[PDB]
Structure 1
């Protein structure tokens, strides 16, 4: 409960980014094996996100799920800040997606279920999410997927703030599923302008090898109007999902 850097025996550099570096680590006390991010407050300031982090570490800490990367604890010295995190032994879905180019109908559906499961929990524990990427998806030991993200003159459209923020994740789920099945995201193009074009006008096209159940689901998630995309529950109960999830 009262953490210091010499409570930890340090292993191999696990990669860097963005403010800090991650190392492999072990609790001298419980010999428990975990990752450790090392953020520098100097690097947080020249990016103005010190309070933003502390804010989110308090949110993160109260999220226990097999499909969400577990944060165990945190601490600091004057120069450095440390985050004690679940080591995902099997690499990212990015690296793996490059190794396999695309995934099988079942590998994709299982991954969607897990995401959906995790996202539902967040929605339930009152914490909505923005965008999910393959690069932000880590892999546990048993192939399991881990989200590792980080007046009186005022009108109605300014006091109701952000109306539909819950529904972004369903778009993300649509996009992801596609990339998993195809190897590329659905509005990927050459110019940034042509990508912007296809995202705005919702312009994606399934190559022939894609199944119907997938085309059906993906289309339902990728609706222009946010309030038309299925609620997470429905994704878990989709013919295609309920036929490949395990």
Structure 2
């Protein structure tokens, strides 16, 4: 049921990332194309993120959803840890955003609709990974979204140190929707300290080209008090979503 690094042909690099790169790979026996994530135990141990990692790993392994990057397996050698992941051929949403500068309401709503589903599944399954950047959002063959696995995407309750629950996801959707439409996250600043202040105060403005249908949803998502954020079902049922989703 386990493996080795001898069973893979390593291709081009896909990203630098965190504690090691990710390579395009191919299982020799089956010719299965996949993404191989490499992480150094030593570099892992220096931040001690070994329990949290393997905890995160074991759970994702059993998760099955179109909008979540499949994890097939894992193993280690001596100096590093290998993750066998679903290969998303169309890259990250962040790059597409970089190329397209910004998204239309059609693509945005469709993305948000895809995400809201995934988080609902993630919530029901009682799994939590709270923070979602476009850097960790991947695209499938059909252009479908893929969730894989930093202050700008954190909710006020998290940076303040207060308690938090499933409502922090709603915040993320709000930040992403805005960024998708504008090309910049709402609370972007040239300073960590300034971003912090703006998240805690919820200081943001809409560019003129943003429709009041989108302003509404975003405004209702980016509430400081988590209790006043809508349920996920409400997002999917939102008129601006329905009108522009796919």
Please report how far the alpha carbon of residue 193 of structure 1 lies from its aligned counterpart in structure 2 after TM superposition: 3.7
TM-score (norm 2): 0.91
- The residue aligned with 1:117 is 117
| Structure 1 residues 13 and 188: CA distance shift in structure 2, 3 A | closer
Please report how far the alpha carbon of residue 163 of structure 1 lies from its aligned counterpart in structure 2 after TM superposition: 4.7
8 A Cα contact 1:129 1:166, kept in partner: no
Q: What is the distance in 2 between the residues matched to 1:34 and 1:64?
A: 16
Please report how far the alpha carbon of residue 158 of structure 1 lies from its aligned counterpart in structure 2 after TM superposition: 16
Unaligned segments of structure 1, at least 5 residues? none
Please report how far the alpha carbon of residue 185 of structure 1 lies from its aligned counterpart in structure 2 after TM superposition: 1.2
8 A Cα contact 1:175 1:185, kept in partner: yes
Please report how far the alpha carbon of residue 148 of structure 1 lies from its aligned counterpart in structure 2 after TM superposition: 1.3
Q: String of CA shifts for 1:214-244, please: whole Å, max 9, x gaps.
A: 1110011011101111111111111011111
8 A Cα contact 2:132 2:153, kept in partner: no
Please, what is the CA RMSD of the aligned residues?
5.4
Please report how far the alpha carbon of residue 64 of structure 1 lies from its aligned counterpart in structure 2 after TM superposition: 1.0
Aligned to 2:90, what secondary structure does the other structure show? coil
Q: String of CA shifts for 1:99-118, please: whole Å, max 9, x gaps.
A: 11110101100110111010
Aligned to 2:37, what secondary structure does the other structure show? strand
8 A Cα contact 1:164 1:227, kept in partner: no
Choose 178-187 or 5-14, whichever is displaced more: 5-14
Aligned to 2:178, what secondary structure does the other structure show? helix
Choose 158-167 or 134-143, whichever is displaced more: 158-167
Aligned to 1:188, what secondary structure does the other structure show? coil
Q: Greater Rg, structure 1 or structure 2?
A: 1
Please report how far the alpha carbon of residue 168 of structure 1 lies from its aligned counterpart in structure 2 after TM superposition: 0.7
Does residue 87 in structure 1 map to residue 59 in structure 2?
Answer: no
| Structure 1 residues 35 and 161: CA distance shift in structure 2, 3 A | same
Please report how far the alpha carbon of residue 48 of structure 1 lies from its aligned counterpart in structure 2 after TM superposition: 0.8
Aligned to 1:152, what secondary structure does the other structure show? helix
TM-score (norm 1): 0.91
8 A Cα contact 2:35 2:87, kept in partner: yes
| Structure 1 residues 157 and 173: CA distance shift in structure 2, 3 A | closer
Q: What is the distance in 2 between the residues matched to 1:137 and 1:131?
A: 11
Choose 181-190 or 101-110, whichever is displaced more: 181-190
Q: What is the distance in 2 between the residues matched to 1:152 and 1:133?
A: 9
| Structure 1 residues 153 and 37: CA distance shift in structure 2, 3 A | closer
Q: String of CA shifts for 1:88-127, please: whole Å, max 9, x gaps.
A: 1111111111111110101100110111010000001111
- The residue aligned with 2:146 is 146
8 A Cα contact 2:73 2:84, kept in partner: yes
Please report how far the alpha carbon of residue 153 of structure 1 lies from its aligned counterpart in structure 2 after TM superposition: 36
Please report how far the alpha carbon of residue 161 of structure 1 lies from its aligned counterpart in structure 2 after TM superposition: 11
8 A Cα contact 2:20 2:39, kept in partner: yes
